[PDB]
JSON list of C-alpha atoms and ligand atoms in Angstrom, two decimals:
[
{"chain": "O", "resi": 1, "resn": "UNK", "atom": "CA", "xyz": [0.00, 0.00, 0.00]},
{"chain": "O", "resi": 2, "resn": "UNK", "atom": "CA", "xyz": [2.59, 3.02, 0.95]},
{"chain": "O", "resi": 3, "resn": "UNK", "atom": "CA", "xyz": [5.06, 1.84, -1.22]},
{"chain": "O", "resi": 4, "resn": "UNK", "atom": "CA", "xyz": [2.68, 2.69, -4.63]},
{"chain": "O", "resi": 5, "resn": "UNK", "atom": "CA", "xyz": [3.13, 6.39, -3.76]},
{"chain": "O", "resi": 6, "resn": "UNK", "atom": "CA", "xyz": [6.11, 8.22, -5.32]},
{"chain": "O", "resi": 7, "resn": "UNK", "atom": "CA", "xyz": [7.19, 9.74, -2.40]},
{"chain": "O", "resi": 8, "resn": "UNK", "atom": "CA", "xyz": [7.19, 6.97, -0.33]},
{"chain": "O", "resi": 9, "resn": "UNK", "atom": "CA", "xyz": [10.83, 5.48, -0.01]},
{"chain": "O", "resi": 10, "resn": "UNK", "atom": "CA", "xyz": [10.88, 2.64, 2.49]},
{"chain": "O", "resi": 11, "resn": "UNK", "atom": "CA", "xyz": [14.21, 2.22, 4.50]},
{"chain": "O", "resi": 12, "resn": "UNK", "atom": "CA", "xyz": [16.65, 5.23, 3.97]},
{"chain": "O", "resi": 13, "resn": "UNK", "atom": "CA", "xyz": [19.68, 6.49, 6.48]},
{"chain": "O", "resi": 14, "resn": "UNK", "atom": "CA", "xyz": [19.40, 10.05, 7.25]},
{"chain": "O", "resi": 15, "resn": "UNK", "atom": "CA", "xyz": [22.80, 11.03, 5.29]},
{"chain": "O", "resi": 16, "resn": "UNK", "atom": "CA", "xyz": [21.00, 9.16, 2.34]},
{"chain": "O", "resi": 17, "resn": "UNK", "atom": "CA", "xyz": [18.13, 10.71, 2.51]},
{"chain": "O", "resi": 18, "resn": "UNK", "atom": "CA", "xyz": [20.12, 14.28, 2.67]},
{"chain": "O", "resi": 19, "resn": "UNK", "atom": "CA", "xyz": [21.98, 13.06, -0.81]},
{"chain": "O", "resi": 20, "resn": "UNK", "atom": "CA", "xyz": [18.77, 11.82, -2.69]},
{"chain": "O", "resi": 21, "resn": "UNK", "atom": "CA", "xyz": [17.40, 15.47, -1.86]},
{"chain": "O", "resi": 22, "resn": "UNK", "atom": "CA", "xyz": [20.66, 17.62, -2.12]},
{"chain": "O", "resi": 23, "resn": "UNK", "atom": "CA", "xyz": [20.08, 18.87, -5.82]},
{"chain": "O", "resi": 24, "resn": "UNK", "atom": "CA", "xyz": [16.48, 18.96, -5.54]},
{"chain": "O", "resi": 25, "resn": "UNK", "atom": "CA", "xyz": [14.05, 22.08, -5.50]},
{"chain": "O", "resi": 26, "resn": "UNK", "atom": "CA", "xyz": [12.37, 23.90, -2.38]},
{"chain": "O", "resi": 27, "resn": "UNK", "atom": "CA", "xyz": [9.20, 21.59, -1.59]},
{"chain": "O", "resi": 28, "resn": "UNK", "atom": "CA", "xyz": [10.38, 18.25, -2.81]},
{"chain": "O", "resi": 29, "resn": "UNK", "atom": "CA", "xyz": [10.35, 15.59, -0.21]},
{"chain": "O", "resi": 30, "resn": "UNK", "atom": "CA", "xyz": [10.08, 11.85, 0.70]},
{"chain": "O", "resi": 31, "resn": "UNK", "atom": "CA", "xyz": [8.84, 9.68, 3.30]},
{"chain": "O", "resi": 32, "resn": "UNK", "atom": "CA", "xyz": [10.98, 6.80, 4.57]},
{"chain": "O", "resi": 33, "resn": "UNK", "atom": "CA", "xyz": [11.27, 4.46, 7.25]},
{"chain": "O", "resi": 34, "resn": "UNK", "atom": "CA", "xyz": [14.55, 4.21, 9.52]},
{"chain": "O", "resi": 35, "resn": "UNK", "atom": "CA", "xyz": [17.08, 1.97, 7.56]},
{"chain": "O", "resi": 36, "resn": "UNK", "atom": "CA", "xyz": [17.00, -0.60, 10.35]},
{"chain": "O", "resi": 37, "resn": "UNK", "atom": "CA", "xyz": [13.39, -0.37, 11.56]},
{"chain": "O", "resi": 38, "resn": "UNK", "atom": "CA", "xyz": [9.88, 0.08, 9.82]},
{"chain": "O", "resi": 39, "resn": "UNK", "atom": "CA", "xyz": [8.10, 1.39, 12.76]},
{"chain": "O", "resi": 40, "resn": "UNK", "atom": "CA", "xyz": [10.01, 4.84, 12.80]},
{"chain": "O", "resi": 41, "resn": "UNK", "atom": "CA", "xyz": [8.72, 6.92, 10.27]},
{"chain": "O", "resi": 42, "resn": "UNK", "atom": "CA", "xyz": [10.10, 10.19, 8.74]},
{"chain": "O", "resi": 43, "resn": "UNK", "atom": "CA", "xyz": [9.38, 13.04, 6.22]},
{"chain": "O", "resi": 44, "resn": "UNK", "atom": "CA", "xyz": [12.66, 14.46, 4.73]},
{"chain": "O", "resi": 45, "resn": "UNK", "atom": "CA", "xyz": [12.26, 17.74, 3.42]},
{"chain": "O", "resi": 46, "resn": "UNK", "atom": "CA", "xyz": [14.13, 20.10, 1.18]},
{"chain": "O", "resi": 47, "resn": "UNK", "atom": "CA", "xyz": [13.89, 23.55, 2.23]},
{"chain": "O", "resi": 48, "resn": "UNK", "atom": "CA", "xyz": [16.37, 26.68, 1.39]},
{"chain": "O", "resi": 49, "resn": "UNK", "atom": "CA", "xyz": [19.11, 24.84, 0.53]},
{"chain": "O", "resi": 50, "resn": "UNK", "atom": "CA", "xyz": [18.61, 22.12, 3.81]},
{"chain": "O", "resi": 51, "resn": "UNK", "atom": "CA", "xyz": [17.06, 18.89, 4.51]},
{"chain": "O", "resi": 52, "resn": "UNK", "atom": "CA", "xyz": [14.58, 19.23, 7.57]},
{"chain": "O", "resi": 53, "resn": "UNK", "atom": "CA", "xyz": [13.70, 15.72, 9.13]},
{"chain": "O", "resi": 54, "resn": "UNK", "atom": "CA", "xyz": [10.06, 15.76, 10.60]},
{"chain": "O", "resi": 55, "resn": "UNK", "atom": "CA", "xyz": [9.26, 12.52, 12.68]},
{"chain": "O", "resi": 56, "resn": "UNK", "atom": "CA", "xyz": [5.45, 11.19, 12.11]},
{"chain": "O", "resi": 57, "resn": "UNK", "atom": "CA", "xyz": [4.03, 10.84, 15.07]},
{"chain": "O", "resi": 58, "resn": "UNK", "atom": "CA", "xyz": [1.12, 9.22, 15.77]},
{"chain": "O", "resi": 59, "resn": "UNK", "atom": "CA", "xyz": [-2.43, 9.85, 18.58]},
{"chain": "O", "resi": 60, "resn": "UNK", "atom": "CA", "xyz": [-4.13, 7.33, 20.39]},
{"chain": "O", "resi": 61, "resn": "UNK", "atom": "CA", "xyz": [-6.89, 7.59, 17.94]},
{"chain": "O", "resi": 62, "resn": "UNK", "atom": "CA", "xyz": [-4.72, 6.18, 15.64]},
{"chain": "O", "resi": 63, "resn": "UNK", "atom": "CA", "xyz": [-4.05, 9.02, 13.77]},
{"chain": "O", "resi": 64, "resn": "UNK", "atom": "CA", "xyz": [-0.42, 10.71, 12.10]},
{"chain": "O", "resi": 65, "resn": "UNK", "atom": "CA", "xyz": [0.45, 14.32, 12.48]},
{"chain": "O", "resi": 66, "resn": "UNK", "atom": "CA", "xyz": [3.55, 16.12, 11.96]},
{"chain": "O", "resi": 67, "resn": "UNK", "atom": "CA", "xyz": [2.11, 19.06, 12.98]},
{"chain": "O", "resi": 68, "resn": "UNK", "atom": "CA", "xyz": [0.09, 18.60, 16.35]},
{"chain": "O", "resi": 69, "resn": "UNK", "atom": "CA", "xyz": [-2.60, 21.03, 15.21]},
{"chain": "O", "resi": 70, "resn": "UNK", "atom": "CA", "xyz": [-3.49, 19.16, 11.74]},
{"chain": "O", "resi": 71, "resn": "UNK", "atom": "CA", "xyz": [-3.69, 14.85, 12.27]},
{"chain": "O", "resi": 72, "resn": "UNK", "atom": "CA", "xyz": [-5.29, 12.33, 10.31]},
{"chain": "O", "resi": 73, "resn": "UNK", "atom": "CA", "xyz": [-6.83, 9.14, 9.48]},
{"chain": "O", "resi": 74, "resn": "UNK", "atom": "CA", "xyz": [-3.84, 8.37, 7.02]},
{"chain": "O", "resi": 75, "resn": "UNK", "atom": "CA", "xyz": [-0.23, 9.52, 5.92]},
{"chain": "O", "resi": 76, "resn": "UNK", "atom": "CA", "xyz": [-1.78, 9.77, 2.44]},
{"chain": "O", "resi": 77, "resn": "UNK", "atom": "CA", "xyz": [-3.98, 12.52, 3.76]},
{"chain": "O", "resi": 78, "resn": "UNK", "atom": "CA", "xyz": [-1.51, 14.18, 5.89]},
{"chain": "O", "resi": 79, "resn": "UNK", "atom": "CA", "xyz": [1.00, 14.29, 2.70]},
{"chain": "O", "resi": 80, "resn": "UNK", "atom": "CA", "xyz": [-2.15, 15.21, 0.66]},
{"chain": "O", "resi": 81, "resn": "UNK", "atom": "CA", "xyz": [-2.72, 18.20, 3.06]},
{"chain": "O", "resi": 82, "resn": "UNK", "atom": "CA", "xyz": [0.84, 19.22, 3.45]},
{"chain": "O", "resi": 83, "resn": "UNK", "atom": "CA", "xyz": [1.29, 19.56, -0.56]},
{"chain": "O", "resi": 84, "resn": "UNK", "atom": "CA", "xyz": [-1.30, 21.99, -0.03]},
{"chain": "O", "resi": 85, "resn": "UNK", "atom": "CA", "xyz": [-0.48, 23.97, 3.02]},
{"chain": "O", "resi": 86, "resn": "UNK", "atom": "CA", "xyz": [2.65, 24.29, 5.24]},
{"chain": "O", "resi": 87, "resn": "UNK", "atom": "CA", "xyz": [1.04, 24.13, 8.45]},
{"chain": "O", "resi": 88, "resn": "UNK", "atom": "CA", "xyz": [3.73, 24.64, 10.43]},
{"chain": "O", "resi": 89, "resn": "UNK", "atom": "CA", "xyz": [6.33, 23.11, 8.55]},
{"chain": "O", "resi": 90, "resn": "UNK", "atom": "CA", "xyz": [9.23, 24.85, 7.07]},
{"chain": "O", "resi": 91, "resn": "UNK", "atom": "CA", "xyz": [7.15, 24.66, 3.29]},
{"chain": "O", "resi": 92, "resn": "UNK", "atom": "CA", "xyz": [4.42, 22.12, 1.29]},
{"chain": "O", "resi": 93, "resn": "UNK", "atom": "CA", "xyz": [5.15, 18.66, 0.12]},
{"chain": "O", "resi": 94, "resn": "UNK", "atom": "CA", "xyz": [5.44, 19.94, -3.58]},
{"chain": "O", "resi": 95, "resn": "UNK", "atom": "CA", "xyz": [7.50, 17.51, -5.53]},
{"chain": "O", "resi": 96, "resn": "UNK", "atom": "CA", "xyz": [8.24, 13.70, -4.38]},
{"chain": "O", "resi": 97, "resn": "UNK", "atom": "CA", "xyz": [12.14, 12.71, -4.86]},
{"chain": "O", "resi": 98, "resn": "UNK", "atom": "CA", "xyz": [12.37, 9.97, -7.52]},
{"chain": "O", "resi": 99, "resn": "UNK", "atom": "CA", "xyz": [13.18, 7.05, -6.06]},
{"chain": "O", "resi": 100, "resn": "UNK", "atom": "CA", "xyz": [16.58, 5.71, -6.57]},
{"chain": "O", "resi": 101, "resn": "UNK", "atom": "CA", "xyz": [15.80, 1.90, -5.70]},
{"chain": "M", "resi": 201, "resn": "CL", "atom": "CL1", "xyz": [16.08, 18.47, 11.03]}
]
């Protein structure tokens, strides 16, 4: 299921990550898991020349946030909302990073 998004990357290292976004534009982003551990989940995002790592967190209504004041049902929707409107984070979710793989 997350894997047939675009900007969904699976297991990649922070300093990986940081390369696989280091020539991209403002906005473009991907999602990954730790390298070692599917449960902690990421958005790496490119941003004025840096990569900002936001953590996914998640409520015990079983809802994802990275911003405490916007959470929802799925990460689809929360990258779906995010493409749309910072809300609170450094800018959107514009442009998911091709996928090396
Ligand atoms: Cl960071």
């Amino acid at each position: 299921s997350l894997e047939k998004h675009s900007w969904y990357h699976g297991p990649v290292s922070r300093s990986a990550a940081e390369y696989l976004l280091s020539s991209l534009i403002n906005g473009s982003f991907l999602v990954r898991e730790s390298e070692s551990s599917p449960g902690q989940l990421s958005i790496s995002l490119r941003y004025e020349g840096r990569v900002y790592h936001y953590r996914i967190n998640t409520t015990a209504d079983g809802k994802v946030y990275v911003t405490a004041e916007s959470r929802f049902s799925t990460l689809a929707e929360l990258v779906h909302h995010h493409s749309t409107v910072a809300d609170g984070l450094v800018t959107t979710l514009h442009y998911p990073a091709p996928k090396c793989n």
